[PDB]
Amino acid sequence: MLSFQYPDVYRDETAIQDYHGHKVCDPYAWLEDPDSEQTKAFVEAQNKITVPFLEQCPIRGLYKERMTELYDYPKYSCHFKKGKRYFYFYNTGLQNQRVLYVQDSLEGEARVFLDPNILSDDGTVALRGYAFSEDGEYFAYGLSASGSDWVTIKFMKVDGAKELPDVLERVKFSCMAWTHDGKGMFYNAYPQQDGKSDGTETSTNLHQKLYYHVLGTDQSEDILCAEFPDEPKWMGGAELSDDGRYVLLSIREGCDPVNRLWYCDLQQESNGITGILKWVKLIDNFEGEYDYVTNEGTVFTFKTNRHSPNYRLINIDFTDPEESKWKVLVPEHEKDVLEWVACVRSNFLVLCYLHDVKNTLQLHDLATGALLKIFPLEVGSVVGYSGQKKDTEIFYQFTSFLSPGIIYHCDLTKEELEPRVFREVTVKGIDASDYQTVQIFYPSKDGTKIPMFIVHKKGIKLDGSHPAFLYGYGGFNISITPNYSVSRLIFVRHMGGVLAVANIRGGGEYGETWHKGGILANKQNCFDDFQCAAEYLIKEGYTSPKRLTINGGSNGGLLVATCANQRPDLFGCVIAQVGVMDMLKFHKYTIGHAWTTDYGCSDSKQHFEWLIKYSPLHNVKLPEADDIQYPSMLLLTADHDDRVVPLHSLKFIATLQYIVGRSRKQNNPLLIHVDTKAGHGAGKPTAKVIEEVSDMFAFIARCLNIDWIP
Numbered sequence: 001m002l003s004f005q006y007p008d009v010y011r012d013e014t015a016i017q018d019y020h021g022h023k024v025c026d027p028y029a030w031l032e033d034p035d036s037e038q039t040k041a042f043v044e045a046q047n048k049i050t051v052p053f054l055e056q057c058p059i060r061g062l063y064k065e066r067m068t069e070l071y072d073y074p075k076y077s078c079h080f081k082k083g084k085r086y087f088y089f090y091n092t093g094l095q096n097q098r099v100l101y102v103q104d105s106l107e108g109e110a111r112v113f114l115d116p117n118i119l120s121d122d123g124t125v126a127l128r129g130y131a132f133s134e135d136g137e138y139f140a141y142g143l144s145a146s147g148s149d150w151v152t153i154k155f156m157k158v159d160g161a162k163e164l165p166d167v168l169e170r171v172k173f174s175c176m177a178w179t180h181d182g183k184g185m186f187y188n189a190y191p192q193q194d195g196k197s198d199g200t201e202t203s204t205n206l207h208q209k210l211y212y213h214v215l216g217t218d219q220s221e222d223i224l225c226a227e228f229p230d231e232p233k234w235m236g237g238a239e240l241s242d243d244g245r246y247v248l249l250s251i252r253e254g255c256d257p258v259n260r261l262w263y264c265d266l267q268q269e270s271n272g273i274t275g276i277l278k279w280v281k282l283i284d285n286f287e288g289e290y291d292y293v294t295n296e297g298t299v300f301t302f303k304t305n306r307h308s309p310n311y312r313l314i315n316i317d318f319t320d321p322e323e324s325k326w327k328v329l330v331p332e333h334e335k336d337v338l339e340w341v342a343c344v345r346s347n348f349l350v351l352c353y354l355h356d357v358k359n360t361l362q363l364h365d366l367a368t369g370a371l372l373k374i375f376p377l378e379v380g381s382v383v384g385y386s387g388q389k390k391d392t393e394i395f396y397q398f399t400s401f402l403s404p405g406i407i408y409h410c411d412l413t414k415e416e417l418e419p420r421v422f423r424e425v426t427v428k429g430i431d432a433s434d435y436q437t438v439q440i441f442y443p444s445k446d447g448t449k450i451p452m453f454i455v456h457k458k459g460i461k462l463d464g465s466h467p468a469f470l471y472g473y474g475g476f477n478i479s480i481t482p483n484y485s486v487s488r489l490i491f492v493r494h495m496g497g498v499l500a501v502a503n504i505r506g507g508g509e510y511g512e513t514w515h516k517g518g519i520l521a522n523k524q525n526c527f528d529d530f531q532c533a534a535e536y537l538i539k540e541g542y543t544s545p546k547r548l549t550i551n552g553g554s555n556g557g558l559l560v561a562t563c564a565n566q567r568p569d570l571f572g573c574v575i576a577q578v579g580v581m582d583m584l585k586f587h588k589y590t591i592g593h594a595w596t597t598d599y600g601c602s603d604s605k606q607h608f609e610w611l612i613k614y615s616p617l618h619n620v621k622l623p624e625a626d627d628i629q630y631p632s633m634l635l636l637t638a639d640h641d642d643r644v645v646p647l648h649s650l651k652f653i654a655t656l657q658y659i660v661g662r663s664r665k666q667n668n669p670l671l672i673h674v675d676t677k678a679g680h681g682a683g684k685p686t687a688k689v690i691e692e693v694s695d696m697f698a699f700i701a702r703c704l705n706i707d708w709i710p
């Protein structure tokens, strides 16, 4: 099949680094520089063979057409109320960016409030974060260009939707928190740095600061409120307590679910916000997470993992703050993860649990923690919620594998709490009842039972004959829960595919013990789990190695690239999106230093020994057996991915093409596509989202020779 030749790519054989006595060659180190003519020529040469490979088979156009048609349905988010007005996001179906609407009442005529689509032709300027003032009369919103994590914060007066002059630059990984006096807003910014700050640079992000911006002034007048010059990795995010009296500062270092918690009683400020605040260091270590729910006077309710891997609710009274004095308000469940908690209608708590990777939602009494009400749900996920302390109603959104889902509304002023369907839209073309979702638990190599969701047409024979698409992540305490995907359902209905999602270790599905079972020394458990999932699918007759595709993104990109090196015989096709591929150097770039809490760092001899064993970049190797080759591989990245710098994929693909691509037994393609005006994925315009899934499933169809099923 292979009609093209791989590009010439220079190998710098002098690029040799010593890691604790282990010599490491890095002959594509030069691809780390995004601005060189050499790297630009590399990207161009690579896209030049990938694109015509992707678009040769009629199948791309059929998939694209079907994706365009089926994805074109109305998409609503959760209403939420702010001051006198209700807001929601809505996309008519195929707008690049969803639009923010406003109404003066739940029944009232809605109008456009913020439409990002007018800010660019190609929809590559996207909303990233926002915060209303406490009275709902002012509005701050972050804009990101071309997919970058970099943000510019702008402001509007809600009444009349008037643009204000205030502009905040150098915002990244930022809180947005207005003081209740409506005077201004906390946010984070990074000091100036040499070179570019647009998403194409690789420079490490250090010394994040906390500022306060007084509305109606220039950024240069902003007050510095917290900084950690002795700890360049610390990140301090601010929020105001529900009563406006306290600034709560959550300090993070890395990606672990832990934080310091300092507070500032604003009323104790000598003269308002004029400099570094009088922080009281309530929790001054990184031993646990303390996520503010609400407070009453000095009694502060937090969701925590302190002594509770599945999370619980505690009350810490600032006037009596020793741990031995804390009250357990809602104790830890023996198995179920308490995902998030909100306070609504003064004295209700809304708790969301994860029970075997499905959400439940319950109402509890603030005073006692006692359960008052269960909101019934089908099997799936809660993905949107609104209802704050002063609100007297909630909205929440249910989604699953087979339906776009339902937005519920509940008037909490009623004696009987009847949640009612607020929005529900059907996707005609996909009849949910032709398909089934099953959950099974398969043993991993050490015997640990791993959950897996399988979605497939009803009535199929388990004869190994179906193409399968297996998804995984396995990291960072992230739970992979049911979500609605038109793109994956087209693979099912129109490509005859079986979809599967493996809840491997590293995620949050079973609390912190599940997270710890897939990080640091034990990162190999993630790859073992995911390999064992593929083997389950094969052994039970859902698919066969030659028809199996694996997919994951970012940390999941690492997952699938590692599995390709480790078990090339198990997979027919591998699509790795925005993957971390150089595990020896990831910490050097942008925000990579934050991931060491899951991965370790190559500066440590112990950690190096874990990393070198699975680093995708450092484990590309011809399979020993003559009858075994590497799967077809597609790496997807983009030139403004400042989350996972695209050098990871560039170096990885250069290595694959040289070590494996040049062998005579390698007939499967090893390709990269680097998109432009795009980044990690957040805020990607519909047009690109459609191009992307069309590329992926066309790659799959062509490598596995799957006919379209009309």
Ligand SMILES: *C(=N)[C@@H]1CCCN1C(=O)[C@@H]1CCCN1C(=O)CCCc1ccccc1
Pocket (backbone or CB within 6 Å): 173, 235, 252, 253, 254, 255, 476, 553, 554, 555, 556, 580, 591, 594, 595, 643, 644
């Ligand atoms: C992808 N999956 C990429 C590469 C590995 C980790 N990662 C992430 O995006 C990572 C997973 C959870 C969030 N995250 C970040 O890198 C967030 C960056 C900002 C941040 C915020 C709070 C604390 C530390 C860092």
